[PDB]
Design a protein around this ligand. Structure first.
Ligand code: HAM
Ligand code: HAM
Lengths: 364, 386
């Protein structure tokens, strides 16, 4: 017997912390849903040439970060360090791009071999967004408006700055960049043009932006994206315009918990089901299942493994149950169930056929 | 151009939709039982899988995707989730003298020959409960699954196979007999006393719940950490290679992996097999369109107007899916794009409308369009959509 630890730089998100993640995620997804964007799920592993061909060879990602390995069949495989390439790839592969428009988003883990700190993980997660078929600066502005809406939704708008600039400058890129700035101004979105802003990836053409934070609630940048009109062709498909971005969920989760500790998730248990005595378990479990039928949306946990009423009532407190449906030998024979409000301590005996209604009132 | 690694799929917008509807329902039912989500790393030290799953098992022998890290360490993309789960639990002190009712969803990697229900990158939704011994929690897990089947309406196409493989002793006693017969040419008979009680109590609980099962004495799982209770939910619609959900006890794994002995039980399900079984048995488990309202808008400097009205309508109509057309196009092109997405209504925004402060609300299903003041469109849409 020995202990195996987690690969350094790879994290486990425990029960308490995932509850926050679930809230933040759903909010993000909900807003994406309101703009008409569809979800696409892509492979964690792709062939190495994809990342070499797309990201660029003199990039520090390709140079020193990819987690690459050789498959049983000699093929070199690489665990995705970002997600646009795979997207484009899947796009070209199923023929979703040629003379079509797609507004997609994706979420999942990315991998990069890096020396961990505040916001640098070896296994990290991105919410990414990509649109195909639209060139003008209009769509460029829609994406920024979308990010903007996310900040407001999460209550962190006063902690993210927007950086902007074009790496085309040539005439066309100027008109296009100007139009973008102008849409932003109209939207009342506050920006800062930065001449030295260039992304670490070699596939961006005109537009390049970045939302940043000072709380280092991220690693500075929290979201970053840009346009890449040539990547579809470069990877073997007919030329199509494209733009998107991806955000560091860990950074985001960090920024929110910092800007507003007033954020919380619903507790896990609403009702705890205490039961003790000879042959009560089947009764208790049968009741629990009925309460589940009648009370859709209630989080009810059935104690298991015996324990006296004192221990069980304490388990109810551990979980944060507000109500406790109790049931011993008597209740079972009499066809009742003791409903105990753990907040006021007021318990009452109710006929089982009426417990659902009672709980309903106690929970609001 | 590059293709995808064989045995690893892409889930497109169309099907993605069916996955989220199925996943939600799953997560919702897990929530109604008080189970918490836990998230674990996709890669772990190879020795964990070797230690946990067993050396002479098919997974370890020929399916894992191992490789070396820059520092010499052996890394393995997980082929299952229980090991990572137990590991993370011992590592953060979540199991000692504690109870947990966890679940997780994610990818699992196995190097197998791709078939109808076998892929190299597959997804599991699993459940692990630590700290409870008796057959009660075992029965709960089986009921949890039954609720899912009903929720998804495939209850009629999934059977339950059950079996007890007793304790270490019984299995080490069954060897002599088994092996002896093997050299030459039943498990239930070497089952220690304690294991027979446990399995009977378990069975006694399922009958009462009205859950139908079938004891299968040749049912052993393909992993080596399991102890008493063992089960699999199987479908004849071959929506899978057969088995859609499978699990069992594994009381000794937490200690073996270097922690204090705590009991544990869990299971994991193949989402692909499930999604397949559902689309099969439930012919039209239709998901809703990605677009409700499409925003037409052509004319001089109309876009800032359109994008602005669009932002307002999102604030007023939370829940609606509204897509703002982009890249120009004549009303004819745009109305077509609306059809493409399946928008039921279109709010048109020409040059007049900008000036007159109106917007035309076009009911795509009946063609009857009307001009409404912008302060009243939200209310107008609200009605058209019900
Ligand atoms: N090791 C890490 N640990 C934690 N968070 C990290 C790590 N590396 C990057 N991030 C997060 O991911 C964001 C985007 O990463 P990137 O700068 O490599 O660009 C891109 O990925 C492009 N794919 C953006 C894109 C998508 N579509 C178009 N352009 C960063 O701003 C940061 O929040
Ligand atoms: N290549 C594949 N493609 C698609 N689906 C697949 C593939 N391999 C396995 N599955 C799914 O994973 C389930 C569990 O099969 P398993 O025998 O690998 O055991 C286990 O995973 C145990 N760890 C379950 C467990 C957790 N806790 C206790 N027992 C199968 O019933 C099937 O639905």
């Amino acid at each position: 017997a020995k202990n195996i630890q987690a690969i350094r730089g790879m994290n486990d998100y425990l029960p308490g912390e995932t509850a926050i993640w679930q809230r933040i995620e759903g909010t993000l997804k909900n807003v994406l849903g309101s703009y008409g964007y569809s979800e696409i799920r892509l492979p964690i592993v792709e062939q190495t040439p994809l990342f070499k061909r797309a990201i660029g060879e003199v990039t520090d990602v390709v140079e020193k970060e990819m987690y690459t390995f050789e498959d049983r069949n000699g093929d070199s495989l690489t665990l995705r360090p970002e997600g646009t390439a795979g997207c484009v790839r899947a796009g070209i592969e199923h023929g979703l791009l040629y003379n079509q428009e797609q507004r997609l988003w994706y979420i999942g883990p990315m991998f990069r071999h890096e020396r961990p700190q505040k916001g640098r993980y070896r296994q990290f997660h991105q919410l990414g967004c990509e649109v195909f078929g639209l060139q003008g600066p209009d769509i460029d502005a829609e994406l920024i408006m979308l990010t903007a809406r996310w900040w407001r939704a999460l209550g962190i708008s006063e902690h993210v700055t927007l950086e902007l600039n074009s790496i085309g400058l040539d005439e066309e890129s100027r008109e296009h960049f100007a139009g973008l700035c102008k849409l932003l101004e109209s939207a009342g979105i506050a920006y800062t043009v930065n001449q030295r802003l260039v992304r670490g990836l070699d596939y961006y053409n005109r537009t390049v932006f970045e939302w940043v934070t000072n709380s280092l609630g991220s690693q500075g940048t929290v979201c970053a994206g840009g346009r890449y009109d040539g990547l579809v062709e470069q990877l073997g498909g007919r030329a199509t315009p494209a733009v998107g971005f991806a955000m560091g969920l860990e950074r985001l989760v960090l920024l929110v918990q910092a800007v507003n500790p007033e954020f919380k998730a619903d507790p896990v248990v609403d009702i705890y089901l205490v039961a003790s005595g000879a042959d009560t378990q089947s009764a208790a479990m049968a009741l629990a299942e009925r309460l589940r039928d009648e009370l859709p949306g209630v989080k009810l946990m059935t104690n298991h493994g015996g324990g006296n009423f004192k221990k069980q009532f304490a388990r109810a407190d551990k979980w944060g149950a507000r109500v406790a449906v109790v049931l011993g030998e008597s209740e079972v024979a009499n066809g009742t169930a003791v409903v105990k409000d753990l907040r006021s301590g007021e318990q009452t005996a109710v006929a089982q056929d009426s417990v659902a209604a009672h709980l309903r009132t106690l929970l609001g």
